[PDB]
Amino acid sequence: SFSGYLKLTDNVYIKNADIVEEAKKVKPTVVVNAANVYLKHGGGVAGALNKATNNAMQVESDDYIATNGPLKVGGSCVLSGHNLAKHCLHVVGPNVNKGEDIQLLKSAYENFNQHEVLLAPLLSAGIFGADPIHSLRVCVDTVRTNVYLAVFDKNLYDKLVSSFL
Numbered sequence: 016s017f018s019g020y021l022k023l024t025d026n027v028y029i030k031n032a033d034i035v036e037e038a039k040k041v042k043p044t045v046v047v048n049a050a051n052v053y054l055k056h057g058g059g060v061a062g063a064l065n066k067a068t069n070n071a072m073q074v075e076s077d078d079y080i081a082t083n084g085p086l087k088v089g090g091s092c093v094l095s096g097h098n099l100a101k102h103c104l105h106v107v108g109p110n111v112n113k114g115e116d117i118q119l120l121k122s123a124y125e126n127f128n129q130h131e132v133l134l135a136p137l138l139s140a141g142i143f144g145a146d147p148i149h150s151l152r153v154c155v156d157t158v159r160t161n162v163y164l165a166v167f168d169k170n171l172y173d174k175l176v177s178s179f180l
């Protein structure tokens with residue numbers, strides 16, 4: 016199972032880890048992708064997860080969008096986890112660099128409550144432009160299921176743990 020995580024709360028755990036390497040190691044039931052509404056996995060966590068699937072995640076995602084249309088900001092969809100997980104929960108957090116409402120971050124985290132255990136990144140963090148300290152606070156105050164957070168950057172991981180109230 017998950018190893019080397021620091022326990023933040025009853026149900027939230029955190030580790031300084033590459034979420035692709037973590038997923039390939041654990042092969043969790045659910046890996047969360049930091050998706051956009053179009054499921055265009057170009058960069059950040061989405062680009063890294065997609066590249067690990069040899070683009071199979073993008074091929075599957077384009078078929079999903081062709082059939083269903085784009086997701087909503089704050090929404091999600093369950094697709095295959097390919098070689099990384101049983102399932103991938105593609106969750107759209109608000110992209111602050113697109114003027115999207117930061118209040119949608121709580122709605123985005125609510126998607127995690129439909130899964131008993133998840134491997135996930137901090138939503139809206141990184142290239143999505145939100146404050147990762149704020150994302151972690153919304154995560155612990157919204158998610159009730161067991162969430163194992165992988166934070167890629169060591170310096171950000173240390174800042175998140177040392178400032179966690």
Ligand SMILES: CC(=O)Nc1cc(Br)c[nH]c1=O
Binds near residue numbers: 167
């Ligand atoms: C290649 C790459 O984008 N690496 C990662 C970035 C972030 Br943010 C999270 N996890 C990663 O594995």
